[PDB]
Amino acid sequence: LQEQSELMSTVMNNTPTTVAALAAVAAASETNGTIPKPRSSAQLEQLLYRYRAIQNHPKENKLEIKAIEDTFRNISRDQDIYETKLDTLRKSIDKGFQYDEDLLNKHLVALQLLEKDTDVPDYFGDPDTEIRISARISNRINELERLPANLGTYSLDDCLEFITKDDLSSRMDTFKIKALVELKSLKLLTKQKSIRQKLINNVASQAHHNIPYLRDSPFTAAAQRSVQIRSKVIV
Amino acid sequence: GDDEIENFRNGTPDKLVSDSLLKLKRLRKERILNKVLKPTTEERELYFKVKRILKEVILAKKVSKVPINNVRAFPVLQTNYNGSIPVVR
Amino acid sequence: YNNVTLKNLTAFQLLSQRENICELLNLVESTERHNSIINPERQRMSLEEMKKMLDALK
Amino acid sequence: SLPIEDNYIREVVGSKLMECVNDAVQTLLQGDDK
Amino acid sequence: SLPIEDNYIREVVSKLMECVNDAVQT
Known part of the structure; x- marks a missing residue:
């Protein structure tokens, strides 16, 4: 039940000693399914730091201190292993390789595009695959709609304008317009679809009076000629 | 840790990078075609392992260009404030 | 498949027009469409039927 | 004309x-000898 | 991890x- 978010909620509510998660087998082990080895850089580790620093006062009501300290031992051991491996890795380098430039370009651009979830070109119907497109657009809409409205730039070209304490520079909004062109272009999609239908179903709906090589064929001219035959008058 | 980069640093550094980026691209296709949103713990672990290697050459070799291309801006928050004229009902 | 279109008529005429030019250059065989319709054993079997009709009618 | x-589309979906013969016939319509 | x-990106990316043997003959 997200104990690694329950610690964050108890920290941000500023009352963590008053509850202390009721560390028994019935409560502290029901959310764990040891502790699950936190994932973040420090956002789930500083919480463990503060949690141990608050639980130094009771020291016996909470039996889960030992598994947390075992994970501190694991973190210290992994850190010492990485420091020894970084000491050896800087000694295992060849004296000459002369890494190529125009492949370093491609690795940097490819890593940068693979960070922020966009498609990388290689250079090295069916409503199953219709929903898998219409579920990537809701991703982008509900990711752009969580940006703060007070978003603003600071380009490297405001130094040539000498902005005072209150001067209102003229390149402050080169990202918030761009973060609304996407968010409103991804909501006007089923309007340009309905305009493209009215375009194609009135250009292709003639198809034999505008295109020259179709209205000059034998069979099209014969069909258009034969539909215009006025019915025979008996007597 | 590293556990492989010591062994592969003895030869060329660059083959593992492309052989890992192709795996990232295949895993990204397999995440798109599965309606999953969070990345797995198998490519995240495989992501930093890429970014380490490209760091170390820049630490070690000092490759002749290491090109610089930036958008020359970055987003910052700016102060907001309500209007001072009161509301009319 | 009961009806014809402009695409069907154009494809039929283009196919039948390119099959006729490929017999001058002899880059297509077309021996199967020949011999499945000639079929000389069927021809002599039919001639034997005509001969038996001559015998039965005389 | 906006790619939205x-x-x-390029993500999900990668004689x-x-x-x-026409060149041969255009060469056949040059000299009478063929 | 600085954006480019x-x-x-639109710049790097018988x-x-x-x-005849049948046209020479016939």
């Missing part, structure tokens, strides 16, 4: 014989 | 003789 969903 | 310019 073109990137997601000679008769031309030579 | 968009205008740089059938012959079978007729």
